[model samples]
Target: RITQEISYNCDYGDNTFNLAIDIGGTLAKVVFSPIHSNRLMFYTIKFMELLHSIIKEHNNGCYRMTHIIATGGGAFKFYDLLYENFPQIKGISRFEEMEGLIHGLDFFIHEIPDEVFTYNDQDGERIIPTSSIYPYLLVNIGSGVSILKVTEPNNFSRVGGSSLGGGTLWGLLSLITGAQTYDQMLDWAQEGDNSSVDMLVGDIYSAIASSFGKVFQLYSSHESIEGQMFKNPDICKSLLFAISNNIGQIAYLQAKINNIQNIYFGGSYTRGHLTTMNTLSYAINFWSQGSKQAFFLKHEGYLGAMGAFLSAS
Candidate 1:
């Protein structure tokens, strides 16, 4: 019952239908129309289990599908598994990666309403816009972080990225807190006190006031820990904050160096987290003198899936 009001438009004139799947390293998302249903349906399942399920559900007694529209890294890595289970299924690796994103963005921008909401640490709200300021940056945070410099609406380049991303958050949380799933870890983070875990400028108020006065300094570069104390919850909060802040600062610095004004943050890593978005917004605003704005997408996690879906066209 994971229904979403997507703005993607489908052409039913030819009355032909196809299935699309975005198989990521961690998850697999499938979209198909039921045999007797007119409406399209979509669902996400564990990556490891998707092949068997797809076979069992769509094997057609003897053989499975002959072709499939697949995207994401897993499509290549798990090709054998899919082929072994469904020998007849031929995977069509999507090549129109950039185009899919642009198409999906265009579709969403034109059809989706002004306000888009998502559930996470808090109920998040964002406004959809038809266009964005030129010479901007797009930082997509998923399993990993990818920074793109978009000079125009559909033109962009992968400027940089890092392995430290949502996977890091999930791995660390699992190792340290024994959380079983990403949602569980996020829920724990929401309940835990961040100030108790993070280091802040106010923590060195006395030292700063006595020496540097009120001069502004980069928080990420701050080294003061004189009076700071550490706790598990605080450590978790600090880790999350530091990781997100580092990403924001890096993205801002890159944009500043390149003279870009707008930064749109996307990808599965965002997870509709307010803290991450707020941190990015603050960093961009602070560095750009309020001239630049940071934005988030409603389908933050489905860029690749939407890309795969559009490949059918």
Candidate 2:
């Protein structure tokens, strides 16, 4: 639904072609070059159907089409659709999703000066230097979470993961808040008062000690003679906080276990939301006592697609 363009000069072997896609369960991220230009454009759409028009409009007689790269689960799932449609194309190369993410991250870390940054209420967003790029944790919050420990540019391993991720929040928010889209849910979250719905540490204790503590309190707020009410905004905010905080805590734990200090949180779930980023940043800081930090990418959702684009190069 959105188109973004960036200028980057890169040549893949002798072939003068550019097209790569990372198709996941919900969205397909595509990176392509315009006709006779080095400027690359990207899009997040529903399927490869839109890609046919995109490529047709962008591909002129100037560039020779060589191979197209693809990654993620959808690549394998939609192989027939990719293989038979483009007969003129030489071949469709498939790359691993995790590998694509790491490579894409490495490319951006080296090329873009302000690609990676951190968020906090007190400091806003602070861009981290790309000089030190290795020995960090990558927490990708897609439908699910995959935590990887990257030591070098090409070396990394999946350390931990969680089923309770973006999909969890997405599913729950739909049912509880009756939200039509993810962005709508986030908008509601921004207007929400979490303390009104979620049971907080101060809710139970007259003198609170621990932070973000909960004791499984089950009761509705406001016992007035009118009626019981649970605001959708409050529910959205509380649920979002719950998911983000859990992911951040697990990310910190994984970083600590791996002895890695830097944690990069990617995937479409973040959506560059102010509340989400602030919650994650606060979570890491509160848990690590200012030792660990949570980092986010400017194009947080396109890491895999970007990696796939750079694969042949």
Q: What's the CA error at residue 126 for candidate 2, in Å?
A: 1.4
lDDT comparing candidate 2 with the true structure: 0.80
Clashing pairs in 1: 66-90, 196-234, 197-234, 197-235
Model 2 TM-score?
0.89
C-alpha positional error of residue 281 in candidate 1 after TM-score superposition, expressed in Å: 2.2
How many steric overlaps does candidate 1 have? 4
lDDT of each: 0.59, 0.80
User: How displaced is residue 121 in candidate 1, in Å?
Assistant: 12
RMSD of 2: 4.7
CA deviation > 4 Å runs, candidate 2: 61-66, 206-228
Candidate 1 Cα deviation (angstroms), residue 94: 2.4
